């Protein structure tokens, strides 16, 4: 019954926290929205192109 992970993953998590310290709040929301819209558009184009038979 342990939970705390090894120092490797903990170091990765500290790097993730520094990354969180960069882009944040308004910038983070804009980035999330842009990524979702662009990914949806790409998937839609791919599906339409496949629709041919």
């Amino acid at each position: 019954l342990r939970t705390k992970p090894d120092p490797e993953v903990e170091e990765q998590e500290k790097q993730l926290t520094t990354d969180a310290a960069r882009i944040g709040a308004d910038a983070a929301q804009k980035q999330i929205q842009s990524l979702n819209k662009m990914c949806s558009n790409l998937l839609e184009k791919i599906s339409k192109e496949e629709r041919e038979s």
């Binding site: 019954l1 342990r2 939970t3 705390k4 992970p5 090894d6 993953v9």
Partner: protein, 61 residues
């Protein structure tokens, strides 16, 4: 006086002594917060069935 009352839950005479943290709204009303278990005079906090599994899957993968 009802509130934060750490109370022993289960006890084995030599080593095992489990403690529970309760928050009472009124007499005969108990809300369990957490569980701290003492093994061999060493106190640990009881891991959630799910936080433990999340960390476990993360390390393996």
């Amino acid at each position: 006086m009802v509130g934060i009352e750490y109370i022993l839950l289960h006890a084995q005479e030599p080593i095992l002594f489990i403690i529970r943290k309760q928050q009472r709204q009124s007499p005969a009303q108990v809300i369990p917060l957490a569980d701290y278990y003492i093994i061999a005079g060493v106190i640990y906090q009881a891991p959630d069935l799910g936080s433990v599994i999340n960390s476990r899957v993360l390390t393996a993968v």
